[PDB]
Design a protein around this nucleic acid. Sequence first.
DNA 1: CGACTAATTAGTCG
DNA 2: CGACTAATTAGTCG
Length: 71
Amino acid sequence: SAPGGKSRRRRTAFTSEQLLELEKEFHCKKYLSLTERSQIAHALKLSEVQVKIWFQNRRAKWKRIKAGNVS
DNA sequence: CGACTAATTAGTCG
DNA sequence: CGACTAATTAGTCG
């Protein structure tokens, strides 16, 4: 077991096992509390940071619309 | 002290 | 060469 590739793949690497519980909340609520976000990533082999980008990228698109305009 | 948000950044796609 | 998406990352409240 040794590393090979080292690049920031812009597309969260999700797996079927992970998607099973990940999609669960997506079909439940679009807002996760402290005792929610920090729990899903603790239930299995995950990290709170990874579960954050998932939501960030979704809101990032909204920040491009809900802002100030010019001219 | 850590998570959450959001901006910076990085990199492949167009 | 541009653009957009996303990990990176730091600030601030919990």
